[PDB]
Amino acid sequence: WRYGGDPPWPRVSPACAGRFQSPVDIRPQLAAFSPALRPLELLGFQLPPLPELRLRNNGHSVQLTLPPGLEMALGPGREYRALQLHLHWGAAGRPGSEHTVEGHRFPAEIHVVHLSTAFARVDEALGRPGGLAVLAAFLEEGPEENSAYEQLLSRLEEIAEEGSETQVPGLDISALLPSDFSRYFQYEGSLTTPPCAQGVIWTVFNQTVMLSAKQLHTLSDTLWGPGDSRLQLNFRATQPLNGRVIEASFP
Amino acid sequence: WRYGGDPPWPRVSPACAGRFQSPVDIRPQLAAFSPALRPLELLGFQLPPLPELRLRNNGHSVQLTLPPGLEMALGPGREYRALQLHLHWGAAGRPGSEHTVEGHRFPAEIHVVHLSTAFARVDEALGRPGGLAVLAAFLEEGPEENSAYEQLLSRLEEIAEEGSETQVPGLDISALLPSDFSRYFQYEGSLTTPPCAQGVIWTVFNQTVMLSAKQLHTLSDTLWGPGDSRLQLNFRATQPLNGRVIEASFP
Ligand SMILES: COC(=O)CCCNC(=O)c1cc(S(N)(=O)=O)c(Cl)cc1SC1CCCCC1
Ligand SMILES: COC(=O)CCCNC(=O)c1cc(S(N)(=O)=O)c(Cl)cc1SC1CCCCC1
Ligand SMILES: [Zn+2]
Ligand SMILES: [Zn+2]
């Protein structure tokens, strides 16, 4: 499978033709205020420098594999373990976030992919209700170098080639996310890549993460993907809600 | 295991001492309204008179085995199949519902136990989030004989003995439930019997169902449990919410 051509994703995975797919366009005025949505809780996300983590150009994204003991709760009794994070981005003067807001596409988007603690392995969780939870934040331009992101972005040159990887010191993984864990949208969707399995709980933060113009340029670019092609515009088109209601932790 | 058969359930089954157990006290004023909770969809519940259904005294309840094809949705793409329904009840003028509302215990409670269509087997669903969903309705005293409930109560004589069972004509299972499928409380908890597994989605109807005093007396007076004891007060004590917010489908 790849972005921007064949095979059709449903030939790869029938679930890529499901009714309830991600990403979606968030229209905050059609969002449902639910005060049952409490602030997210992250434990164990502040890692020591050793052991190191693996950072990989997989030809679809840059992926950081997370070690055991990163605990995330969507609320009381809704418990997850973090597996990995990866990024979606565009190209020189083209935004490449997956999710959109009132049709606006942000420069880039981070995904932190988690597994329900009721499941030992991802493949057991795929297609199961609440089996996987993703935390999603938009990356936008700010005036400062983002030092947390600099630790990954400063290493993309080393992994320019499709299928290459490097080791990086442990860092504060939660510094890659917005500081505001209270304001977010939540809906039920799918993986945005094959096999596009449904039953995924998507949390999208109100607050965006700020990178320098240079940092956003580094992210788009530096990596190469399938063939002699640049790894850019690695986002799936917006998918219809098809009767789903996005909830919001705020009115 | 037994109801008030001290020693306590946590020895038989230490999941019974989990943080997120059922049942709970519903306090409507503290419930979170989410306009995302849509009306329950129950299709295939209008059963023909043939085939017959197994009705059984298991010494903990009377249980009706439900056939394939009873489809239920809690939301878009969130589907279930009904497996069985069973009742919880009191004694000679002592109420026996499992959920309470602001401390009010109701005379009885019907539970309709469903299996998520993302799970082949109940034993894969036990302990997983949303694996099982129960529809729960309160049984109150009203002036009239309940038609739907007569079909089950009229047959308890035949199975008064722990372990006994009979075939009963098909019936409209949906007729056992309240009027308004748009008005319910919802939270996540556990089986209210051993093994007390967590991840059960509980839906409790706002509106009740009315049975005659003769009918309520029949329910609690006709059946025998373990030992030479009456099958009565077959309900678990109220469990703490521990931070879980109960949701409501209505402002
Ligand atoms: C060698 O090339 C690849 O591995 C491509 C896989 C890219 N997909 C993911 O890493 C991924 C993305 C999401 S997303 N964008 O919806 O947040 C999620 Cl939720 C999970 C995974 S990993 C999954 C994909 C294959 C089946 C099990 C592991
Ligand atoms: C057959 O008698 C027994 O010994 C086991 C106790 C019966 N319990 C249930 O039937 C039961 C009750 C609920 S409840 N009160 O929370 O709604 C639920 Cl959700 C499921 C079951 S059946 C389940 C229990 C053990 C594993 C197989 C199926
Ligand atoms: Zn992603
Ligand atoms: Zn029950």
Oligomer: homodimer
From the spread of the alpha carbons, the general shape of chain A counts as globular
Please summarize the sheet with the most strands of chain A: 13 strands, mixed
Determine the number of helices of chain A (DSSP H or I, runs of at least 4 residues): 4
Q: Could you give the distance between the termini of chain A?
A: 40 Å
**Could you tell me the number of beta strands of chain A?**
16
The run of helices and strands of chain A is HEEEEEEEEEEHEHEEEEHE
Derived from helix and strand composition plus strand pairing, the structural class of chain A reads: mainly beta
Strand content of chain A: 25-35%
Radius of gyration of chain A: 17 Å
DSSP helix fraction of chain A: under 10%
Q: Quickly count the domains of chain A.
A: 1
Major interchain interface with per-chain residue totals: A-B, 29 and 28 residues
Bound molecules: the ligand COC(=O)CCCNC(=O)c1cc(S(N)(=O)=O)c(Cl)cc1SC1CCCCC1, zinc ion
EC number (chains A, B): 4.2.1.1
Function (chains A, B): Catalyzes the interconversion between carbon dioxide and water and the dissociated ions of carbonic acid (i.e. bicarbonate and hydrogen ions).
GO molecular function (chains A, B): carbonate dehydratase activity; molecular function activator activity; zinc ion binding
Keywords (chains A, B): Cell membrane, Cell projection, Disulfide bond, Glycoprotein, Lyase, Membrane, Metal-binding, Nucleus, Phosphoprotein, Signal, Transmembrane, Transmembrane helix, Zinc
